[PDB]
C-alpha cells in the first residue's frame, strides 16, 4: 500500500467549543473550531488544542458529524439521547483526557459496527461539580441500537461490569432525569 494518500474517515466531523462568555443565550456561546475528514487532519487538530483537563470550568468540546449541530434541537438529536459518563472531581486528573480521547477515536473510527449511523456525536463538559462525557445518538426508542452502542462504549473505555452507565433521552434531560437504559 502507498503512503502519500491521507487516511479518509467514513464521516466528516466538526469540532465545537463552548464557553459561557459571549451571550446570555446558550446557543450564541458555541464556536465552530474546525472540520476534518481524515485521520491525519484529526491528529493535526487534536495536537493544536487544549486538553479537556486544562480548560476552564464551564467549557465544552463537542465532536459531531458535519451537518448535525451539537444541540438538542437538531433534527438528528431531538428524538435522541446520550450515554453519560459522570466523573468525580479527582477523575479530571486520572481519567478525563484519556476517556475523551478514547471517545473521539470511537467516533472517527466508526466503532459501533451496524449501528454507527445512530451515533450523532460526543460532548465533554468540564465542570467544577464533576466532569461529564457523553455519546449522543439519534433515536432514544431504538433499544437494540442504543444498548449496542452503550456496550461498545463501556468496553472501549475499559469500565468493569460493576460500573453501570445510563442513557437519557434529550427530551427528558431538557424537561424540569431518569435512565431509559443501563449497561
Amino acid at each position: 500500500p502507498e503512503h502519500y494518500i491521507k487516511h479518509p474517515l467514513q464521516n466528516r466531523w466538526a469540532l465545537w467549543f463552548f464557553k459561557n462568555d459571549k451571550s446570555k443565550t446558550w446557543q450564541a456561546n458555541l464556536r465552530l473550531i474546525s472540520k476534518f475528514d481524515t485521520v491525519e487532519d484529526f491528529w493535526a487538530l487534536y495536537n493544536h488544542i487544549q486538553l479537556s483537563s486544562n480548560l476552564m470550568p464551564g467549557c465544552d468540546y463537542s465532536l459531531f458529524k458535519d451537518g448535525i449541530e451539537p444541540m438538542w434541537e437538531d433534527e438528528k438529536n431531538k428524538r435522541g439521547g446520550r450515554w453519560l459518563i459522570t466523573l468525580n472531581k479527582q477523575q479530571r486528573r486520572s481519567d478525563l483526557d484519556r476517556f475523551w480521547l478514547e471517545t473521539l477515536l470511537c467516533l472517527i473510527g466508526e466503532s459501533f459496527d451496524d449501528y454507527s449511523d445512530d451515533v450523532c456525536g460526543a460532548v465533554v463538559n468540564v465542570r467544577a461539580k464533576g466532569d461529564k462525557i457523553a455519546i449522543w445518538t439519534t433515536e432514544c426508542e431504538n433499544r437494540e441500537a442504543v444498548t449496542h452502542i452503550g456496550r461498545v462504549y463501556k468496553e472501549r473505555l475499559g469500565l468493569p461490569p460493576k460500573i453501570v452507565i445510563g442513557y437519557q433521552s434529550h427530551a427528558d434531560t431538557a424537561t424540569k432525569t431518569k435512565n431509559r437504559f443501563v449497561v
Binding site: 467514513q10 485521520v39 491528529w43 473510527g109
Partner: peptide, 13 residues
C-alpha cells in the same frame, strides 16, 4: 464502511 481500530488511529498520530 471505513473503519479504523484503536491501534490504527494511534499509529497514524
Amino acid at each position: 464502511r471505513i473503519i479504523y481500530s484503536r491501534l490504527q488511529l494511534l499509529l497514524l498520530k
